[PDB]
A paper describes a structure:
Anionic calixarenes are useful mediators of protein assembly. Symmetric and chemically uniform, the macrocycle acts as molecular glue by masking the protein, simplifying the surface features, and providing a homogenous scaffold for controlled oligomerization and crystallization. In this work, we report modular protein – calixarene cocrystallization. Motivated by modular crystal synthesis, we demonstrated the possibility of interchangeable modules in protein – calixarene frameworks by swapping supramolecular synthons.
An isomorphous structure was obtained with PK‐RSL containing a Pro‐Lys N‐terminal extension.
Residue numbers in the entry: 0 to 90
Amino acid sequence: PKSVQTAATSWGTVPSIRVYTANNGKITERCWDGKGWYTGAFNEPGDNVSVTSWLVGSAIHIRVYASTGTTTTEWCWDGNGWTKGAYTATN
Ligand SMILES: OC[C@@]1(O)OC[C@@H](O)[C@@H](O)[C@@H]1O
Ligand SMILES: OC[C@@]1(O)OC[C@@H](O)[C@@H](O)[C@@H]1O
């Protein structure tokens, strides 16, 4: 059977949670900061998604790896918007 594909990350003690869903070639984002789920700003093409995040002090940084075909694109959140990162594959 078919299934959407998700990736999740969280930070802090509230916590904040971000869940990324690849569905029909589009990746969207759902967010929790303790008071209900809502739709996040992230919207990029892809059929597979992974994510990692880390804190520097109180500031979150998120990296989303979106794959279409053999091409993986890294998207970066650093507090002020999503930008394309420097990631490229080995071969
Ligand atoms: O406050 C929500 C938000 O700014 O949190 C950080 C990232 O998850 C963004 O995509 C998202 O819109
Ligand atoms: O632009 C932000 C950046 O430098 O952050 C660290 C890595 O995620 C890099 O690929 C990325 O380009």
